[PDB]
Amino acid sequence: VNSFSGYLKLTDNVYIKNADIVEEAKKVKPTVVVNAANVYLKHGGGVAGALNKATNNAMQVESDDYIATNGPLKVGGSCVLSGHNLAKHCLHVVGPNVNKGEDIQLLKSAYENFNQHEVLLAPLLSAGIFGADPIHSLRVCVDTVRTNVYLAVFDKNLYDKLVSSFL
């Protein structure tokens, strides 16, 4: 039993809710919240900008030190950093950004990072300002992640479309 509430069950291990991931993280304080990161961990907009803003920019400060030490992530890769006031840990995962021409096949590699964590609160990777089709992202999630994932979808209209079209 866990504290996630109001989710629709899609499969054995994947759950979905119309929710603001920032507000959901604040309330659940999950072990792991996933950030929709870029390789530079520049958390300017989308989910990343919202998560970082909720940490009062502490996520960005920590991220800048990480990059200065380690260099950029790979597209499809991830790193574990602090969850600050939102979660124990933040798993920063880089999905491909279609608006940069990155290969959508890397979306599966991106979701594979979730399998290193037993339970996660997450957005749909490569959705929103990353330019991929969220219906496809949900399909890859379901077909790749084997651990327990609680997906937060900000837009109510999109949430309803994702549920209604789910196979």
Ligand X SMILES: OCc1cn([C@@H]2CCCN(c3ncnc4[nH]ccc34)C2)nn1
Which residue ranges make up the site for ligand X (CB under 6 A)?
20-22, 36, 46-47, 50, 123-124, 127-128, 152-155, 158
Within 10 angstroms of residue 65's Cβ, the number of other Cβ atoms is: 12
What is the largest distance, in Å, between two alpha-carbon atoms of the chain? 45
End-to-end C-alpha distance for the chain, whole angstroms: 26
The distance of closest approach from Cβ of residue 107 to ligand X in the complex, given in angstroms and rounded to an integer, is 12
Question: Considering beta carbons, is residue 65 or 100 the nearer one to ligand X?
Answer: 100
The distance of closest approach from Cβ of residue 126 to ligand X in the complex, given in angstroms and rounded to an integer, is 8
The distance of closest approach from Cβ of residue 71 to ligand X in the complex, given in angstroms and rounded to an integer, is 25
Question: Considering beta carbons, is residue 68 or 104 the nearer one to ligand X?
Answer: 104
C-alpha–C-alpha distance, residues 49 and 45, integer Å: 4
Question: Considering beta carbons, is residue 52 or 63 the nearer one to ligand X?
Answer: 52
CA dihedral sign, ordered 30, 31, 34, 38 = positive
